[PDB]
Curated annotation (Swiss-Prot), chain B:
It is found in: Cytoplasm; Golgi apparatus membrane; Cytoplasmic vesicle, COPI-coated vesicle membrane. The chain holds residues 562 to 702 of 1224 of the full protein. This is Coatomer subunit alpha. The modification Phosphothreonine is found at residue 30. The gene is Copa. The coatomer is a cytosolic protein complex that binds to dilysine motifs and reversibly associates with Golgi non-clathrin-coated vesicles, which further mediate biosynthetic protein transport from the ER, via the Golgi up to the trans Golgi network. Coatomer complex is required for budding from Golgi membranes, and is essential for the retrograde Golgi-to-ER transport of dilysine-tagged proteins. Oligomeric complex that consists of at least the alpha, beta, beta', gamma, delta, epsilon and zeta subunits. Interacts with SCYL1. Interacts with JAGN1. Interacts with TMEM41B. Interacts with SVEP1. Probably interacts with PEX11A. It comes from Mus musculus.
UniProtKB/Swiss-Prot annotation, chain C:
The lineage of its organism: Eukaryota, Metazoa, Chordata, Craniata, Vertebrata. Coiled coil: none annotated. It is found in: Cytoplasm; Golgi apparatus membrane; Cytoplasmic vesicle, COPI-coated vesicle membrane. This is Coatomer subunit delta. The modification N6-acetyllysine is found at residues 2, 44. Signal peptide: none annotated.
Length: 380, 141, 51
């Protein structure tokens, strides 16, 4: 809504017929129309006049006011234009304005109001429309690959996968002389979700076994967006993506209070994640919490109504806390916990098997790095 | 107590007070040990006596549950502290803002954290100030 | 001795069939990860029927 009501008034001190698009201005409609339209909407013979912080647009017809009211506005031309179209429609129903004849065709006018302005947005009407209704350096040659990915997850307490999706791209930065052909080999991907984009200069090769992609790289860094899955894609985390963290939440009713234990699991112990935070929400009647965690720092935050655990880097780890609650109401359902994390792997499982370059001698793949980041990662 | 008619007190002789109006219809009223006992007790610094005394014939809002947050060296204040505001108040009047932060929390408000943090710096200790000031977002202060 | 609070941790179960009963004095705890049950035990032997 931008348009509170569209209203036909008699300055007898009442709204003769009026329209409330959605239940808001019932009785309210009559008091506004009754006071303000009597004074000419408090006008001076000006179509826009604003009083008691409500914009009134009007036209006098006899002892009656045809009134449009708004308290917000999208454009100048528009407010007049719905009123104007209304003024073509109103004499078809009531032969000018006049309280008794307006009264008798409440249905006609009201229906036009719904049709003309729908949920406060000014649609258009016309008298015919109304009818239907009422009817060279190669020593230097080096290559670097960076796979940056974000994974998203929604999971149940049960550990149901729900939906997930990984988004990522593999950027290549290469310093190679001449123009060398490169062939990229990667693992094969599947995706419940969809998206893959390929950089130009990417060729697709068909082989009986295995899939291959070849391309002459632009020099410097560019999104490979190779063929195959592509080196720019949205893959589904669901499709074979690993979720670096699984959270197992065990809420417990200590009785008056609540004891919550949160279990965090990481992939192989060797790999460590960084920037990990677990956000465990708490109920409104908080009291105070006592939290204990082996690693990292954990802090309760009122306002947020969430307990946040932060761990600089983790092989993997867990936390526990006891909550005190005043118990108003009944038990409350839990809201999901979210996590942020960084991992030095891609959990879209993109692996660069081999990138062989030609047109020259062996280049050094100085480094391949993987940056994995959490997207909306939510578990109940 | 209130009667249902306007009236004039006839006078007080005994515990009762007796009244008659213009038309002269009577009302009588026994002087109670309601409001009277409660404050006779609070004056003689008894809070233990006063808890029994608390009844719903005299509870009001500010004679029991928030009038007792009106000592600059908290005494009355200690006893009623149930309102998150009364709790906040209590804390600055002692000068120990440990309770303030919690009341300030339960008042769900930043302003309280910065003001109690300033009081905190006044009791002398800046750990407490940091915590407050950090969450009011006065990293620069 | 005394009245000690006990927390029980067990593996997570699924059942095609159905039935589970809990002894009184069994509390359910909600945790982000893992599930936990806590209770003050009656002394002597009793069916735990934990959560």
């Amino acid at each position: 809504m931008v348009l509170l009501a569209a209203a036909v008034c008699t300055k007898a001190g009442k709204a003769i017929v009026s329209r409330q698009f959605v239940e808001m201005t019932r009785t309210r409609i009559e008091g506004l129309l009754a006071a303000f339209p009597k004074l000419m909407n408090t006008g001076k013979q000006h179509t826009f006049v604003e009083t008691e912080s409500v914009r009134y647009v009007y036209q006098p017809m006899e002892k009656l006011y045809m009134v449009l009211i708004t308290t917000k506005n999208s454009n100048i031309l528009e407010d007049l234009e719905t009123l104007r179209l209304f003024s073509r429609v109103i004499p078809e129903y009531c032969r000018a304005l006049e309280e008794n004849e307006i009264s008798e065709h409440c249905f006609d006018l009201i229906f036009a109001f719904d049709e003309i302005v729908a949920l406060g947005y000014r649609e258009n009407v016309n008298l015919a429309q109304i009818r239907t209704f009422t009817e060279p350096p190669i020593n230097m040659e080096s290559v670097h690959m960076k796979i940056e990915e974000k994974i998203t997850l929604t999971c149940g307490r049960d550990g149901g996968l729900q939906n997930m999706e990984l988004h990522g791209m593999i950027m290549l930065r290469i310093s190679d002389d001449k123009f060398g052909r490169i062939r990229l080999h990667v693992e094969n991907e599947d995706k419940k979700g969809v998206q893959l984009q390929t950089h130009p200069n990417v060729d697709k090769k068909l082989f009986t076994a295995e899939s291959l992609i070849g391309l002459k790289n632009p020099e410097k860094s560019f999104p490979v967006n190779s063929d195959v899955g592509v080196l720019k894609w949205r893959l589904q985390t669901t499709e074979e993506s690993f979720i670096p963290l699984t959270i197992n939440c065990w809420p417990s009713e200590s009785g008056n209070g609540c004891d919550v234990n949160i279990e965090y699991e990481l992939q192989e112990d060797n790999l460590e994640l960084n920037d990990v935070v677990i956000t465990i929400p708490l109920p409104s009647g908080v009291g105070a919490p006592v939290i204990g965690e082996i690693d990292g720092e954990y802090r309760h935050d009122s306002r947020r109504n969430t307990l946040e655990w932060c761990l600089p880097v983790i092989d993997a780890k867990n936390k526990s806390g006891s909550l005190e609650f005043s118990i108003p109401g009944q038990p409350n359902d839990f809201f999901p916990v979210q996590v942020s994390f960084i991992s030095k792997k891609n959990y879209c499982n993109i692996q660069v098997t081999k990138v062989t370059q030609v047109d020259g001698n062996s280049p050094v793949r100085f480094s391949t790095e993987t940056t994995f980041l959490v997207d909306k990662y939510e578990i109940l | 107590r209130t009667l249902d008619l306007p009236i004039y007190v006839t006078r007080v002789k005994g515990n009762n007070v007796y009244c008659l109006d213009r038309e002269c219809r009577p009302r009588v009223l026994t002087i109670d040990p309601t409001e009277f006992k409660f404050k006779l007790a609070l004056i003689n610094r008894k809070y233990d006596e006063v808890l029994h005394m608390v009844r719903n014939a005299k509870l009001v809002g500010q004679s029991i549950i928030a009038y007792l947050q009106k000592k600059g060296y908290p005494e009355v204040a200690l006893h009623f502290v149930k309102d998150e505001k009364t709790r906040f108040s209590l804390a600055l009047e002692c000068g120990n803002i440990e309770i303030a932060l919690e009341a300030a929390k339960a008042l769900d408000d930043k302003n309280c954290w910065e003001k109690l943090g300033e009081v905190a710096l006044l009791q002398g200790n800046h750990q407490i100030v940091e915590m407050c000031y950090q969450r009011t977002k006065n990293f620069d202060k």
